[PDB]
Write a protein that binds this ligand. Sequence first.
Ligand SMILES: CC(=O)Nc1nnc(S(N)(=O)=O)s1
Ligand SMILES: [Hg+2]
Ligand SMILES: [Zn+2]
Length: 255
Amino acid sequence: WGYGKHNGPEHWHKDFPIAKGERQSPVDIDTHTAKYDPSLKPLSVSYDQATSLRILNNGHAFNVEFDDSQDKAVLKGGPLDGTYRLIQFHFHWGSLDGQGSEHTVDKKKYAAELHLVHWNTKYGDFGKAVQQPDGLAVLGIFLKVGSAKPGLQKVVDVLDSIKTKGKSADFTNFDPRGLLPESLDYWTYPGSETTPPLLECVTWIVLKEPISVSSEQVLKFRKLNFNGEGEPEELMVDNWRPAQPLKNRQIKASF
Ligand SMILES: CC(=O)Nc1nnc(S(N)(=O)=O)s1
Ligand SMILES: [Hg+2]
Ligand SMILES: [Zn+2]
């Protein structure tokens, strides 16, 4: 599976038939059919005791991994019942600045999208959590191209260390708070992981307020490679899944 002509999203259904299931992500957020629900609590993002461990290029994107052995960085509040542990975060980006996001907002596509993944602590570990309809919660953040994001620069600089598939680099003392927008106003809906196994286990929480990063900061994203070392060069660009049919679902807004 990958994002190419022969192994791209329009083919993942053959090994992963859940690709055309019931609650698949991403989706277009139509802001006028989004149901403002005033029973939706504010988000409680507690990320001040976060331990980042490392960064690694896994062939389809890079993941800053975190130590989820204790509630150090947790997400609760909003639509969530219970505490969800931060395990890792990654982006999806495009080859140009008019594509990149997975989720769109009135069919508009932004330059990229940050996903901070969290698993429900009721289930003991991430592994058991994806056996559950409420196992995961992914906080989604849109990136637009403008002024540079200060807090994004440590990530951008490490990317030469992990140019190719399989590479890693110790990456401690990274504080994820530096990537959060000013406002925690979100849209939320039942969905899925957007990369195989496409498990229908995610409560998505997409923020309304994009962060901006600079054009030179996102250029560095597009230098990475899909391919392993000593293999033909495949630039890691456009690693996003097209929007899926909302099928029944209604998207709520906290605003
Ligand atoms: C281990 C892990 O995190 N797997 C994920 N699969 N898809 C994710 S995504 N596309 O929803 O943000 S996270
Ligand atoms: Hg599930
Ligand atoms: Zn993702």
